[PDB]
Design a protein around this ligand. Structure first.
Ligand SMILES: *[C@@H](C)[C@H]1/C(=C/c2[nH]c(/C=C3N=C(/C=C4\NC(=O)C(CC)=C4C)C(C)=C\3CCC(=O)O)c(CCC(=O)O)c2C)NC(=O)[C@@H]1C
Ligand SMILES: *[C@@H](C)[C@H]1/C(=C/c2[nH]c(/C=C3N=C(/C=C4\NC(=O)C(CC)=C4C)C(C)=C\3CCC(=O)O)c(CCC(=O)O)c2C)NC(=O)[C@@H]1C
Ligand SMILES: *[C@H](C)[C@H]1/C(=C/c2[nH]c(/C=C3N=C(/C=C4\NC(=O)C(CC)=C4C)C(C)=C\3CCC(=O)O)c(CCC(=O)O)c2C)NC(=O)[C@@H]1C
Ligand SMILES: *[C@H](C)[C@H]1/C(=C/c2[nH]c(/C=C3N=C(/C=C4\NC(=O)C(CC)=C4C)C(C)=C\3CCC(=O)O)c(CCC(=O)O)c2C)NC(=O)[C@@H]1C
Ligand SMILES: *[C@H](C)[C@H]1/C(=C/c2[nH]c(/C=C3N=C(/C=C4\NC(=O)C(CC)=C4C)C(C)=C\3CCC(=O)O)c(CCC(=O)O)c2C)NC(=O)[C@@H]1C
Ligand SMILES: *[C@H](C)[C@H]1/C(=C/c2[nH]c(/C=C3N=C(/C=C4\NC(=O)C(CC)=C4C)C(C)=C\3CCC(=O)O)c(CCC(=O)O)c2C)NC(=O)[C@@H]1C
Ligand SMILES: *[C@H](C)[C@H]1/C(=C/c2[nH]c(/C=C3N=C(/C=C4\NC(=O)C(CC)=C4C)C(C)=C\3CCC(=O)O)c(CCC(=O)O)c2C)NC(=O)[C@@H]1C
Ligand SMILES: *[C@H](C)[C@H]1/C(=C/c2[nH]c(/C=C3N=C(/C=C4\NC(=O)C(CC)=C4C)C(C)=C\3CCC(=O)O)c(CCC(=O)O)c2C)NC(=O)[C@@H]1C
Ligand SMILES: *[C@H](C)[C@H]1/C(=C/c2[nH]c(/C=C3N=C(/C=C4\NC(=O)C(CC)=C4C)C(C)=C\3CCC(=O)O)c(CCC(=O)O)c2C)NC(=O)[C@@H]1C
Ligand SMILES: *[C@H](C)[C@H]1/C(=C/c2[nH]c(/C=C3N=C(/C=C4\NC(=O)C(CC)=C4C)C(C)=C\3CCC(=O)O)c(CCC(=O)O)c2C)NC(=O)[C@@H]1C
Ligand SMILES: *[C@H](C)[C@H]1/C(=C/c2[nH]c(/C=C3N=C(/C=C4\NC(=O)C(CC)=C4C)C(C)=C\3CCC(=O)O)c(CCC(=O)O)c2C)NC(=O)[C@@H]1C
Ligand SMILES: *[C@H](C)[C@H]1/C(=C/c2[nH]c(/C=C3N=C(/C=C4\NC(=O)C(CC)=C4C)C(C)=C\3CCC(=O)O)c(CCC(=O)O)c2C)NC(=O)[C@@H]1C
Lengths: 75, 172, 266, 162, 172, 162, 162, 172, 162
């Protein structure tokens, strides 16, 4: 489980030096992503590594696209 | 996302049949009480800052270990994050009140909020306690009889309370 | 666009470009191509030295530790990106470079300049850069797995028409890069909500005949003029002059107090 | 589904904003329209079978070749007739859903999205469905705000098909 | 963008003064004709496909050199782009009709379109001719007296025609 | 610039679609609210001077230290009182704009965005403006829809400052 | 936290580089400053109680209304005074942390990030804390490098507050 | 990230207490070792390529199965990846030596490396052995009394030894 | 450029921040190092010609084949020897630039970036230049901080070439 070196921004906030793994399921075609140029490849459990400072953004992104955050684990 | 009308629509589409007379009559009753719902939404958003601040101050008063050094609400960044969650929970409860369905609250706010708090070490029970304090403050505000056309708002108060219960039970 | 306008505008390669998606179970050469595409487009087609390569970031991309969007973000936040696009550039030029590199388009409005300026001033370079990559626009166009590509030459949803025209001010050709401190070409255009004529590829050239001078070269002078003589009919003016009359035309424009906006070979 | 309530909340959520007076006016307009939409839905479902049967017959009358041409996509036999009546019933039912919901959301979610590849894959001409929707427009008997909203949905379908 | 109200608002704030009685009565007049504005928007929308297609057919009949091989409307890709540009112009005209202000039409659609068409080689005069045909058609639907309450929509028709004139002037 | 009409077009254009019945109901809600908003702005305009002077006096009453403490940010002199009266007049005038516009768009564009920077760099207490807004709420004498919409704008400003 | 050593490492890691002579010079500068920072922190924490009490009293004298008017955000009662003294102790303790660390990192981490929306939420004026920090500046008694570094951190808090 | 100062700061802030005299004296002693710490970082950095290459050659001298075909170090890309990893581990050890705290090496390089190497099929034992070889080379170079003001560097060498052991134990 | 002053301002500007005590300590380390660095540069400059000739001869001694086998990439003829002496002079001159600037920034921008492509295209062995740098490091005759800074730049180049 690597990634924290590049995921955590170069800002030296101790709060920001924390990454978390999101497990997302059911990434469906919804009205929110009708004009998505790319196509969904997997609707099962996908793992997204999110730094602390972007956890606000990512979960919103997951929630607009119908994905279900089933688990969140410290990295 | 669902509202009060689209939920009945989606259930009917799954069954592949038209809305029955009773469902149409149920939605007519929902529209007849729609003015109370809008005005209740307006009263919560008009006192949002007071609701959030009073609930948070009361929460630290009865849970001083949150604001003690080492507590989860200690330091300015975590304190600001705490008030922001308070405000976020309140805002999505108003969304659910506006739409008449809990789908916005569950899909966009409570989706993964429990495991967000578990992963961050956030004391979700204290989050639930703060949400209940908003519930008492917001229900008192919605039920305030001054400066408003008198009517019975028991149904909408119970619905708003139910949304607040969903959020408090989700974070617990 | 179609071929007939594409050759004239010099955007044939952009039109025929295929989005590059890192699929699951990709081989080594696919990751190599994806890394190369990200370096080409995020760093604005510079000759990237091997010593400037992000060895750890591309290792995480290779080992499936991060997504293409994360690797794009790592390149954007890297000191290499800072050096060639941020530390020696004005803020407005810097954010149009961000729009070109990260979203593949030109800025649409002056409010987008007002945004990312306050955001820089409040939250630093990192928050300002993360605004593009975490934006709704980045998510629907590129997602987590598609290398960003230039989209300003094609009709997009929720797009202003000016974007297409302004695209030619930020994309100067296939053999061009964003390397030289330079000021934005879109400053006045964005601030006053205007559009500039597109002079790209073969669009800039004009007929010469016998009117051009000794060396058969015409120059187009786009100027902003007011009444300082004869009546001025338009605020914007375009002058086509031969090389032999270029100095004289420039000097008489100067003594009338007219502001020269652009000079190009026609 | 796209509706005044859900769209207002989605716009407010995208900006991270509480519901201001703009959203309240959206809800007021939805309330002003909702009753007429409900009677419109009631009238359409009360007259659903005759409207669907007449719409199928109108399609057959305007395009007679569907009655005698042999093929999986044509209604020459009873199986094709059942499929055609079912499709028109699908169109009518989702329009009532749109009237109930107050927006084109049910049409977009259930019918509009992807209908082009369906018509192409199974060789169904959209002109048949355009004629069926015109019959429903001409024979739903609605008046006032009901008719206006219902015809807006029906023309939305027609414009999507054409 | 701006709507009919915010335009007056922006002008008043720059002057730093309250809206006068005359401006408030002018906006009261504007909201008195709001229903006709909504009807015109709905009527153009309901026949948008017919408006675009009939105007394109008439345009290609009067200007066969567009669809002649080598023409700028020849090939499916260019024909599809042309029909899309007609629908786009019509959509933004309806947006300007809806708001009561032309800012959405100018800022988003019309600004930069002349330079775009000149750069693409799209004949601006032909597009202007297509917009006049859509204008002619759309005013017929807007002014159609069948199935609508009687009234005087001359003012809103002139406003819609003005938006279509802006579109035609912009492309050429 | 958040108003019902501009947001309806912003949402539709972001989805690249024509205005459906959802946006029509948004316009209908704006129409139902507009007359009350217009009468609210006129009532506030005609009563603007007494409201501004009374609001300034209410702030001076609740925060007496503003009237004897020397400093650029206080109103112990006539210059500070002029600045205070002008700021409250700006608040009152922009609220009338919101009532005219039908949304918090004038407040967001002209007053709310950057007010935090201003109150901090010139060490002005937002509590002063909260009491000024509270006085305007208690003394604008509006009733019904006009009162409800005006109080929403005043509470929007109050929640922004608190 | 932002410190000379960690910032040098973070920017070297951003470039995938070993620590060159530039980072070594940064560490040498940190070493030059470190003894004064440690000596300043020890000196500040020795009479931290007296400094905090005097700073709280200075705020009370500069802002007498804080000890007089009722309110959750005011120090009229003992609860408000205990909250106020705890806040001053928070400011002073994090300043000593900054002196120890060699940068404004502890202030940014623990105090500065989010302080303005705390102050807005709880109606605490930043001017109160500015007066407290000004007293701490005027009465710490430090000299030389220790005085300059402690004052830089105190002025950093003041500039962040105002 | 933490350095030697912010580590005790974080512990003190969590307890909400000022640093005691003993903690400040320990930090003062750290400052007294600062020149030696900078010398150790400089010496490892100036011999980084030699340390990594000699250790890799020794690591392939014994354990030949890594470089035989089918082995993990076989093919140029995997050999380059192995060499890259040795340099990365050494680079983060120098970061840890420079900061005086092991947070940078653990958080950015060590945490999650064992599972990553298991998923790729990278032998953790062999890469730990390479880290041990890098340990021995770096410690000899740091403990080189030629060309430096001779002194007692036992404390900084023990810290470097601890960092190398930390790298080897986390990767195995 | 990788120099402490540019580094400090780059970090602050990327953060949109004023120069804090962290940046001041960076400048203090730069100031503590600069005179030794400057006189190392002057010591290297005054002995530059002899150092380059001696470094060139050491490369020829360790790799005798470079002075015998014919080829454009070798120093068999006087043209190749001039190219070799010019290259070693380049290495020494940008090293003095590094000492003046206090970091590896001159080496990165002028020599390190893209040197691998150069040595591959014109088939020059980087080991030759490593030997030249080792001779320069062993024969510059510096001491103390001058030796340490100069050796760091020379070893930076050595590590870059290997
Ligand atoms: C010129 C535009 C044409 C015209 C318009 C016109 N309409 C009305 C009245 C109304 N029309 C509506 C509109 C709608 N109701 C809905 O539910 C829908 C779908 C969302 C729409 C589009 C409404 C609500 C009214 C008011 C009530 C009524 O039914 O009359 C008028 C009358 C005056 C008015 O402004 O209300 C007019 C003039 N009439 C013409 O003659 C033109 C062809
Ligand atoms: C164990 C690490 C070895 C050791 C070290 C040692 N060094 C010093 C003293 C100094 N070393 C430096 C270092 C540098 N000066 C520079 O300009 C650079 C490049 C940026 C470096 C790395 C300095 C400034 C000093 C202080 C002055 C001096 O030269 O003495 C000591 C002496 C005690 C002290 O810590 O100050 C020691 C012990 N000695 C050994 O025997 C080990 C092999
Ligand atoms: C306050 C009552 C309690 C408390 C709160 C607290 N929360 C966080 C951190 C986060 N909260 C969320 C949740 C959301 N973000 C959103 O955007 C939404 C809507 C979609 C939700 C529901 C997230 C994602 C985080 C982490 C990311 C971030 O904070 O930006 C913290 C900080 C935790 C930490 O240690 O960093 C805190 C303090 N804490 C308490 O003690 C109270 C009981
Ligand atoms: C060599 C014969 C001469 C020379 C060359 C030189 N070129 C540049 C910089 C660039 N070269 C290009 C060209 C291309 N990039 C592409 O992707 C394509 C294919 C379509 C081409 C043709 C570009 C875009 C640049 C810009 C910078 C970049 O790094 O990409 C330089 C660098 C200049 C500088 O560093 O400032 C040089 C030196 N120089 C000579 O003296 C020779 C005559
Ligand atoms: C009737 C107007 C004409 C006609 C009809 C016909 N349709 C099909 C088959 C299909 N029709 C649909 C349509 C829908 N299914 C949905 O879920 C909805 C949205 C809710 C719609 C509009 C589909 C998907 C099919 C294919 C699968 C299926 O059979 O259901 C057929 C059969 C074609 C075939 O190849 O089997 C026919 C005959 N044909 C006529 O001639 C009428 C004029
Ligand atoms: C049809 C009446 C005429 C015609 C049209 C035509 N247009 C294009 C290409 C483009 N059209 C636009 C316009 C817009 N894009 C937007 O997003 C907006 C809304 C804000 C507008 C108004 C643009 C930017 C392009 C170029 C990019 C793209 O094609 O997507 C073409 C294609 C040109 C080509 O060579 O491909 C055509 C054919 N052409 C005629 O001959 C008619 C008179
Ligand atoms: C009155 C409630 C209290 C008060 C007022 C006071 N205000 C200022 C200074 C400014 N006020 C503003 C505010 C605005 N400017 C705008 O453009 C708008 C939005 C449309 C607003 C709300 C600003 C920006 C300033 C500073 C610049 C200026 O002086 O105009 C002062 C003077 C502060 C100074 O340093 O000069 C004062 C005194 N003072 C009191 O004591 C009242 C309780
Ligand atoms: C319920 C908790 C409380 C309550 C509500 C209530 N309200 C009404 C009626 C109306 N309320 C509104 C609301 C608004 N008008 C506006 O302009 C705005 C701001 C944009 C809002 C929020 C409206 C339009 C009405 C209808 C007209 C009227 O004023 O009567 C009622 C009466 C029944 C009805 O649904 O109309 C009720 C019951 N009443 C209480 O006693 C509760 C404390
Ligand atoms: C003293 C200068 C003035 C004063 C003080 C006062 N403060 C509060 C409450 C809080 N103080 C803080 C501040 C911080 N908490 C932290 O974690 C840190 C950073 C490490 C700081 C600086 C916070 C967050 C609060 C609110 C929550 C809490 O009570 O702990 C109060 C109480 C206000 C209230 O609403 O309860 C008071 C009274 N007030 C004065 O009158 C003094 C002049
Ligand atoms: C010039 C505008 C004014 C002035 C300056 C001056 N300063 C010094 C000497 C020193 N100043 C410092 C500075 C700091 N030490 C710290 O710890 C920090 C905070 C982190 C700072 C900013 C230092 C280290 C010195 C050297 C030691 C000493 O204090 O003597 C001088 C003396 C000459 C010199 O260059 O050292 C001067 C002249 N003096 C004035 O009168 C001007 C108003
Ligand atoms: C060498 C001593 C041993 C060895 C190494 C080896 N490693 C990989 C692959 C990866 N190594 C890493 C580790 C990191 N990347 C980083 O950026 C950092 C810092 C955050 C670390 C610690 C990663 C992520 C990978 C995967 C990506 C990649 O392959 O580059 C390989 C290649 C495996 C493969 O190609 O499938 C190898 C060979 N192998 C041995 O046999 C030695 C014991
Ligand atoms: C000397 C140690 C050995 C040697 C040298 C040699 N070098 C070249 C050619 C080039 N050397 C460079 C290097 C640089 N140019 C720069 O600008 C810098 C950075 C400041 C460096 C380091 C380059 C670019 C070339 C090629 C272009 C040129 O001719 O100058 C040659 C000639 C190769 C050829 O084919 O002409 C030689 C001979 N040769 C030996 O045998 C020595 C052991």
């Amino acid at each position: 489980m690597l990634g924290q070196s590049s995921l955590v921004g170069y800002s030296n906030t101790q709060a920001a030096n924390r990454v978390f793994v999101y497990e997302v399921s059911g990434l469906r075609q919804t009205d929110a992503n009708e004009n998505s140029a790319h196509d969904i490849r997997r609707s099962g459990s996908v793992f997204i590594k999110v730094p602390y400072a972007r956890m606000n953004d990512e979960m919103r992104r997951i929630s607009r696209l119908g994905g279900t955050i089933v688990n969140i684990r410290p990295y | 996302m669902f509202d009060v009308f689209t939920r009945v629509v989606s259930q009917a589409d799954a069954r592949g049949e038209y809305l029955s007379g009773s469902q149409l009559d149920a939605l007519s009753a929902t529209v007849a009480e729609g003015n109370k719902r809008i005005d209740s939404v307006n009263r919560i958003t008009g006192n949002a800052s007071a609701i959030v601040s009073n609930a948070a101050r009361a929460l630290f008063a009865e849970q001083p270990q949150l604001i003690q050094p080492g507590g989860n609400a200690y330091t300015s960044r975590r304190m600001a994050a705490c008030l922001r969650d308070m405000e976020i929970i309140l805002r999505y409860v108003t969304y659910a009140t506006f739409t008449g369905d809990a789908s916005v609250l569950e899909d966009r706010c409570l989706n993964g909020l429990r495991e967000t708090y578990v992963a961050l070490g956030v004391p979700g029970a204290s989050v639930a306690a703060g949400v209940q304090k908003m519930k008492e403050a917001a229900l008192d505000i919605v039920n305030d009889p001054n400066g408003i056309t008198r009517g019975d708002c028991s149904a909408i108060v119970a619905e708003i309370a139910g949304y607040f219960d969903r959020a408090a039970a989700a974070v617990a | 666009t179609s071929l007939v306008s594409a050759q004239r505008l010099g955007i044939v390669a952009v039109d025929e470009a295929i989005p590059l998606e890192l699929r699951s179970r990709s081989t080594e050469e696919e990751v190599d191509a994806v890394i190369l595409a990200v370096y080409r487009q995020v760093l604005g087609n510079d000759h990237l030295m091997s010593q400037e390569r992000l060895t750890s970031a591309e290792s995480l991309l290779r080992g499936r530790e991060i997504s293409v969007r994360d690797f794009v973000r790592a390149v954007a936040l890297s000191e290499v990106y800072r050096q060639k696009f941020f530390h020696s550039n004005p803020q407005n030029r810097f954010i149009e470079l961000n729009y070109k590199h990260l979203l593949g388009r030109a800025p649409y409005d002056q409010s987008e300049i007002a945004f990312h300026t306050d955001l820089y001033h409040q939250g630093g370079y990192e928050a300002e850069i993360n605004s593009y990559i975490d934006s709704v626009e980045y998510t629907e166009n590129f997602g987590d797995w598609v290398v960003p590509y230039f989209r300003g030459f094609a009709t997009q949803r929720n797009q202003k028409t000016v974007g297409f025209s302004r695209s030619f001010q930020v994309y100067r050709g296939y053999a061009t890069s964003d390397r030289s401190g330079s000021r934005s070409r879109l400053t006045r255009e964005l601030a006053r909500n205007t559009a500039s004529p597109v002079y790209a590829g073969s669009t800039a050239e004009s007929l010469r005949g016998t009117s051009a001078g000794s060396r058969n070269q015409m120059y187009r002078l786009q100027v902003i003029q007011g009444a300082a003589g004869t009546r001025v009919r338009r605020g914007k003016a375009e002058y086509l002059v031969s090389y032999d009359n270029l100095s004289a035309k420039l000097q008489q424009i100067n003594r009338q107090g007219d502001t020269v906006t652009m000079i190009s070979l026609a | 589904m796209k509706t005044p309530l859900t769209e207002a909340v989605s716009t407010a959520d995208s900006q991270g904003r509480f519901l201001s007076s703009t959203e309240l006016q959206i809800a007021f307009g939805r309330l002003r329209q909702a009753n007429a939409g409900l009677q419109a839905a009631k009238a359409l479902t009360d007259n659903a079978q005759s409207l669907v049967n007449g719409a199928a017959q109108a399609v057959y009358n305007k395009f007679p070749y569907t009655t005698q041409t042999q093929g999986n996509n044509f209604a020459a036999d009873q199986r094709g007739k059942d499929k055609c009546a079912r499709d028109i019933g699908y169109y009518l039912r989702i329009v009532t859903y749109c009237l109930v919901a107050g927006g084109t959301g049910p049409l977009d979610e259930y019918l509009i999205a992807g209908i082009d590849e369906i018509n192409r894959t199974f060789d169904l001409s959209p002109s048949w469905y355009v004629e069926a929707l015109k019959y429903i427009k001409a024979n739903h008997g609605l008046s006032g705000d009901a008719r206006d909203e219902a015809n807006s949905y029906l023309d939305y379908a027609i414009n999507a098909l054409s």
